[PDB]
């Protein structure tokens, strides 16, 4: 019942914390990979085309992918890449934290 | 009137990607008012103490910047939440 | 609010005059078709293309 | 795939198993007895209305 | 009373009230039906 769900949730969150790798010891590439850039652009374009608040100033453009590229140029994309290690461990890099090319 | 703490799994809209608390409230919690629920066991008379869980476990719970997991094929985000419901 | 400049024009164009809109998916998933429709009706739809959602359950969506 | 209808659940994994005679007798809609399909669907036949709607006949399930 | 759901053929009974909606190919559903014809079951472990 409620307590069974409580212990299930506790086990799930404990496993999640045991899998997360803290910011002070991640050993992945500092750069943003091409796949990461493409998916971050696609997801940000989806979000803005779904009537999300925007930060950069529109120059009359109406292509959501172009607006997402403008945001990536201005480093205004509020997204996090969760790079998954083979065993399930994950490092949460930020878009601004990564260096594009 | 019994206070029943529950854990939700709700969707977050890109329109509400800037005030996720009010987004979750208006998407899910506000409809539940004055409507009987097949899970809790009574008509919900209100809510309070809505706290959104974090997709990053190492983040301190006192922080104000939490992570929501975006659907791979949709700009919507799904996250776990905790909230107390006033149930009659 | 940044796309109605061209999408309204395409709806006015209709399915036949490139570039145009064959269908206008409503908020509730309804897929209206502009193929068997007149120019004035297409203009009216394009004028009502960007409207506030009257239903609360579908206030987090926009027409396609 | 409409992007305005998000799906919350997800299939984590699938495990192969054996369908036992008890559960299929429990889950089934009706048993099929006579080897006649049509006369209109044959009641108790392969095209019975308990196995789904069929040519403007509303499903009986 | 509340958790009693009926059938078109009159077989009313209480049972599974915990179902979700996932996104799958329909050929998966056809393959599931075909495997059920073979007596084989596939359990789909929904995540949440």
């Amino acid at each position: 019942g409620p307590e069974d769900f409580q212990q299930h949730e506790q086990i799930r969150r404990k496993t999640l914390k045991e899998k997360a790798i803290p910011k002070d010891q991640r050993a992945t590439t500092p750069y943003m990979t091409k796949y990461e850039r493409a998916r971050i652009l696609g997801t940000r374009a989806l979000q803005i085309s779904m009537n999300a608040p925007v930060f950069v100033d529109l120059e009359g453009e109406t292509d959501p992918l172009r607006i997402a590229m403008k945001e990536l140029a201005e480093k205004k994309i509020p997204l996090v890449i969760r790079r998954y290690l083979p065993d399930g461990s994950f490092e949460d890099w930020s878009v601004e934290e990564l260096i594009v090319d | 009137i019994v206070r029943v703490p529950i854990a939700l799994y709700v969707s977050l809209a890109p329109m509400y990607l800037e005030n996720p608390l009010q987004g979750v409230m208006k998407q899910h919690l506000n409809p539940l008012v004055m409507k009987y629920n097949n899970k809790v066991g009574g008509v919900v008379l209100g809510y309070e103490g809505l706290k959104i869980l974090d997709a990053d476990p190492l983040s301190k719970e006192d922080t104000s910047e939490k992570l929501i997991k975006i659907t791979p094929d949709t700009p919507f985000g799904f996250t776990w939440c905790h909230v107390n419901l006033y149930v009659w | 609010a940044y796309n109605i400049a061209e999408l309204r024009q395409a709806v006015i164009n209709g399915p036949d005059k490139w570039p145009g809109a064959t269908q206008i998916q409503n908020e509730d998933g309804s897929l209206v078709s502009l193929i068997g429709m007149s120019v004035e009706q297409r203009k009216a739809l394009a004028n009502q293309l960007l409207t506030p959602s009257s239903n609360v359950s579908t206030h987090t969506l926009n027409k396609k | 795939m409409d992007i305005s209808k998000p799906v919350g659940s997800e299939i984590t994994s699938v495990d192969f198993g054996i369908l036992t005679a008890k559960e299929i007798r429990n889950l089934s809609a009706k048993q099929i007895t006579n080897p006649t399909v049509l006369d209109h669907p044959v009641s108790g036949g392969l095209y019975d209305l308990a196995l789904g709607a069929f040519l403007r006949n509303l499903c009986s399930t | 009373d509340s958790q009693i759901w009926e059938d078109g053929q009159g077989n009313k009974f209480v049972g599974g009230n915990e179902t979700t909606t996932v996104a799958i190919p329909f050929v998966l559903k056809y393959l599931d039906s075909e495997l059920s014809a073979m007596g084989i079951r596939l359990r789909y472990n929904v995540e949440p």
Binding site: - | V4, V10, H28, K39 | - | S9 | P48
Partner: peptide, 18 residues
């Protein structure tokens, strides 16, 4: 209705009604 936009995917009781 009942899309994944008005109703939660899962409602789970954290603890007994208190």
């Amino acid at each position: 209705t009942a899309t994944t936009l008005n109703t939660p995917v899962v409602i789970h009781a954290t603890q007994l009604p208190q």
